[PDB]
Amino acid sequence: LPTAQEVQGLMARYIELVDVGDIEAIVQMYADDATVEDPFGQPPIHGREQIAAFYRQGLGGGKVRACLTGPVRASHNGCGAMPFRIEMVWNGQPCAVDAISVMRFDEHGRIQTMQAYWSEVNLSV
């Protein structure tokens, strides 16, 4: 179970992997039975294949950038939350999303649950 410092490291690493677009490396951060709710409010997806498909759809387009917009907030029970911004292209036009990711890690340091808070009010095209 990651310490608060280790959570800061892991969640920062996740953003780095999204930024360079390494689908396989992202998927390996997840527990094999992990759930993802992105955006929060939508039905969860379950398991590494479904999670792989999700990131392939989102990042497979090639030109996606992601960065922390503030520090990772970490707990002492293997959880954390971070503010970030994703920049993509739908239109040929640049668009961006401001989001917050909340993660719970398991006792092996893998992501058990991820929830991403955002909606169209956080979108700019």
Active site residue 106: no
Sort residue 38 into left (φ over 0), alpha (ψ -120 to 50) or beta: beta
Structure tokens at 35: 């759930």
Cβ-contact 96, 65 below 8 angstroms: no
Q: Is there a contact between 95 and 89 (Cβ–Cβ < 8 Å)?
A: yes
The yes-or-no answer on residue 38 being catalytic is yes
Write out the DSSP string of 53-89. Answer: HHHHHHHTTS--EEEESSPPEE-SSSEEEEEEEEEEE
Number of domain units in the chain = 1
C-alpha closest to that of 93 among 49, 121, 63, 50: 63
Contact 68, 82 (CB under 8 A): yes
Assign residue 58 the CATH number of its domain. 3.10.450.50
CA distances from 105 to 65, 78, 97, 113 (A): 24, 5, 24, 7
Q: What is the resolution of this structure in A?
A: 1.5
Q: In Å, what is the CA distance from 17 to each residue of 11, 14, 97, 107? A: 10, 5, 17, 21
Asked whether 115 and 37 are in contact (CB, 8 A), the reply is: yes
Q: Which of 30, 38, 98, 106 is catalytic?
A: 38
Output the CA torsion sign for 71, 109, 40, 80.
negative
State the structure-solving technique: X-ray
Domain that holds residue 40: 1-125
- CA separation, residue 87 to residues 72, 93, 115 (Å): 19, 11, 19
